[model samples]
Target: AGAGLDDPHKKEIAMELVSSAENSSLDWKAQYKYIEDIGDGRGYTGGIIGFCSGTGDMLELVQHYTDLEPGNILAKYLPALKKVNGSASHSGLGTPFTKDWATAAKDTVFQQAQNDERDRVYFDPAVSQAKADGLRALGQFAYYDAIVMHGPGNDPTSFGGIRKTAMKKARTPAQGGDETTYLNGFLDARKAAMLTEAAHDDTSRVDTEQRVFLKAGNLDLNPPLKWKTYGDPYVINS
Candidate 1:
């Protein structure tokens, strides 16, 4: 099957999963205004999927936001964004720049920008990779979730490295391995990476959430989902 959001029912489930893990809410669309610096070395983590200022993606996200709405709050920082794109520096993005992000969140335009950029950069690519790898909705989400947290890294510490390591242990279904076996390895690697990072050290999102679905044999991520994130339980009633 394709990624969950491709289907209405599954989309709701996936979004809830994301919202729970990202903001601890069921309303992802309402989380546009959220911004914080969690001391993760990334500057100004904001929006639904936690776009960071230290990383270029945040700059790109603001650029896209300005494109969507010329008068968007973050528009004034275009110059600063360009400079901070490649570095983790907070230079030029200190005061009003950070303050404006919160003010802008109430605007539909800023919210749309967040939604658009997330789908464009993170969600789409992850789903495409999952589909090509012959993974179902759950696995597709696993990819998306990992990328959101660890990202598409070619380096040993990134998701790409973690995925590559898993591939060595058990090939993906597309590579002629059992789906369950491959996913277990993938989850294992994901947990290992989570353990290394203080911000992502908690493995409940995997052990109790994604891993729960996998253990239930819901390879396709069919309806009637039930799980918890950070020990908070959620259920999708069929």
Candidate 2:
């Protein structure tokens, strides 16, 4: 054994290093867990999903107790899932399986309601306290789905008098929790539609749509974040 490399191997030893940088570079824990849990679960169905803390809402909690404007509980809990796959975080900006799917569900409900003169359901009090918290009308109903939809949800050339209603409502300022109730109401309707959409909420759409591991709500804004869109069919170009 002249001068073999370290005498061939005088007892090889392996060491594991852990650091902030190392941790940061490693795959996200949520991604790992997501896959591990839903591995046997189906995900082909198109649906929407979202994450929430068991604790109270960040907005509510923070507003009620803290002076820290930036540090929020919701922020702390919900990480941007760029990859919400079985082994990812955000899957995508608006997860098709979860976000888009759920959106479609809600979209269906809203459009049907709009056509039936049921904006009252959305704006009406009999719908639900969550949605009925004084939700007048869209100042300029340019929601993501409004112009996005076709025959039903999309803004019509003649909105009859919804505009006047919206303008009248715009006269007042948005209350703190009012928008919250309105958003929750929207979610409620979406869920209700989902119930019938699935024929029952107890059943899963894994066979047709998707499972419920990833979520798709409250991505951009909440309640009403003043998200304005202006691209008239006769004007602006996307």
Candidate 3:
């Protein structure tokens, strides 16, 4: 069976960790209805995982939600979402789209779609890749967070590229290398990638939070955890 962050309880911890950075709140559940521009150039950043209108994930989410419940509110905007899939234009999806997204968030099916899409697009692939590297929970969380922000693309700023960059510096645990050393390398690569984007320029999430956990030797990510992101303090007592 999957131990570490793959466990249900640990996965919740992973969610809260990502939420602290994405929504500035540990209450990840409250963010299902959350939608805004946030001035990130990713178009409307919304939902629990901060799915972006500029990015394809938000479009995929609406499509998935539509499939689950035909004629859903957000389904009508599929074409507009597609049009704005690569830039922060918000041409067809302006204030009305945001309002409808808030309404759609109230539905259980929409919530389920967000949860499933989060796992399918971000969480599951991250944990699976980390496990293949023989990392523990903390490393798994690290991968998940990086994937959430940098995406699963193959570009230099993408998750795959960041991992490739780290692999050159320190071998992964599966490569018979030290765990801490490898994570440090990965975080270094992640921080560099974050700095490339103005929206992600603040590296406190990596500098203060994940690095703190790694330095503490909290490989399994056991709590009462203490950390900060964007200078906001958070604690998860277990």
Candidate 4:
């Protein structure tokens, strides 16, 4: 089995690391049932990976869940989800939709669907690309976080675009540049991307969390990891 973040234990840690920033708690598992609009302009940020109603991810999630089990609780809302894509609108998805979402979360199949979709869409690509760049676990995490915040799209504000901007500023480790230097450039680019969105104006997830590990040279993401996001403290003792 691959070590570092690809290792199962470390992957769990990675989930917690992201949960701390996204859900304001380290209990990433609990976020499986979490659903709400946090006024981030994305609408109905929910589930472990922060799938959004405005974005296509949430719609995809529900669609996939329906595929796994026909007539599932959320399947009826597919039309609404498709309609509400690209904007924050709950045209057909209101309190009943939320209630069913919460009810659906308790099913193991729905949970597995969430897990599968997360790995397929976000975690696998981030880790694979980071590994190709010769980044260790921390850098893998940096890429994962970036893709989570800025979608995996190629737009100027998206993850691929951020990487493009970073490459212009510094060489990747795979290109025979220093790893720390490359990661710093990546973070700089990511923070700039974050600032472009009013909801993502807070950069502490980069500043206090990832940069804290980077400064300490914890490239493998070995713990006792301690950091703060949104002014809340969290620790992961390994």
Candidate 5:
């Protein structure tokens, strides 16, 4: 039984190491095509799916399309700060150094708040209302997030730079750096996302994107993708 469980974990780590070393060697095109699904020759191991966060890409798309960027979205939220603030002693940074998590989170909030303020001031009155509504969605990550940015080398002592929070770190065995197909899909997705931004200008594209949501997943698609969450701001995007 342990063997069954440990084998895949071992395999994933071994593959991740190879990917990391090979990452430095590959060109962009090669890396994107790395993660192969040699099983069916489709090059995909399986799908990834996840649940809703109020600030999911789908919701972001709507807000972006509608020109909404709300301000008070997170104004009402104030949870789990004591641990965050108290962590300064443990964060290893120094005095005035709260737990790195706390400091970073607070800084991020301030940054977004500033942007929210800007949207209110610069956007036209009609657009400002929509922006205000969108602002309400901003605090979703205040208390919650996924590990979308997580991949490869999640081991701390062994992997070193895998996760890198002030208090902890991890690295995956599947570095994902050489995940070729995943990389290519990611690049293609980036293009789609960027194009979606401009698609608003195309009307047809804007209308189509209205269906997506915040913290949404690709569950509806084939292959049954499941998104693995790591924290408040990251998810296994792939």
Candidate 6:
């Protein structure tokens, strides 16, 4: 089988792996409409990538759909959505959002919004960077998962900055270093990012999952994978 980020089988493995970590299930399609607050300060976390109502991305996703269709379910939420960006409070959004937010998830347009936004904001850029760095499938997915949890951008705690930190310690193969060693450095930096917040301290996603693959020298992420996230066991049969 082909083993790049764009490979269909690899992409499926990537999504199922991420779903196992994010939603405790490999059933990602089932989570297309899921929404709730896990209370990590992002506010009203939901969707496949855990888009937040208080954060700008969920608002952006809603806006994308609303722009395409003027009366999209979340269109009425525009005023409140703009006001809540980057906040943990839902003062202006509670009533209207509670009424229609979950309702919006049932729509095909809303589902597309989530997928498009996930790609635009997190997945595509991360995978692109990994491919450019000469990483194989597992490393490509490692970057994508890091970006999902740590977020994009250059703040020291963000995924981009964390990767930049690792690059200082070890060169990627394209830059003349061993692939496994460079990936280990990347995971080490990712672990440090996890430690900064108690919510992210579990580290099993990095330690047990990604590092195990690296240790086994499965750079292309060949199957029959087994790992755990936050103590939940998972296996991906070949």
Could you say which candidate leads in TM-score?
6
For lDDT, the strongest prediction is 3
lDDT of 2 at 105: 33
By TM-score rank, best first, the candidates go 6, 1, 3, 4, 2, 5
Which has the better TM-score: candidate 2, or candidate 6? Answer: 6
lDDT of 1 by residue, 1-238 (tens): 5435567777667778877787777788876777777776887887888888877777888888778888776778889888877666777888777788889888887777887888887778878888788888888888888888887766755768878878989989998888889899999998888888875547888989899999899888876888888888888776
Better of 3 and 6 by TM-score: 6
Query: Distance from true position, residue 17, model 1, in Å?
Result: 0.8
lDDT of 6 by residue, 1-238 (tens): 2448768788889988888877788888787666777777888877788778777778888889887677876787788778778788786777667668778778887788888888898888999899888888888999999998899999998988999999999999778888888999999999898899664557788888899888888889889999988788899997
Q: After superposition, which runs of candidate 4 have C-alpha atoms over 4 Å from their true positions?
A: 37-43, 79-92, 199-201
Error of 3 at 73 (Å): 2.4
**RMSD, each candidate, Å?**
2.2, 26.5, 2.3, 2.4, 23.0, 2.3
What TM-score goes with each of the models?
0.89, 0.18, 0.88, 0.88, 0.14, 0.89
TM-score for candidate 1 = 0.89
Q: Pairs clashing in candidate 6?
A: none
Give the Cα error of residue 140 in candidate 5, in Å.
23
Model 3 global lDDT (CA atoms, 0 to 1): 0.91
lDDT digits (tens) for residues 33-147 of candidate 3: 9999989688998888788898888999989999999989988899999988899998988999989999998999999999999899888999999999999999999999999
Q: How many steric overlaps are in each model, in order?
A: 0, 24, 0, 0, 55, 0
lDDT of 4 by residue, 1-238 (tens): 1566889998999999888887788888898898999987998988888889998999999888989999788888999999999999989998998999999999988999899899999899999989998888999989998898887877889999998998899999899989999999999999988888875557899999999999999989998999999888899989
The Cα local distance difference test for each model comes to 0.81, 0.24, 0.91, 0.89, 0.24, 0.84
Q: Candidate 6 clash total?
A: 0
- What's the CA error at residue 120 for candidate 1, in Å? 1.9
TM-score, predicted candidate 3 vs. hidden true structure? 0.88
Angstrom error at residue 201, model 4: 4.4
Supply candidate 3's per-residue lDDT for 4. Answer: 84
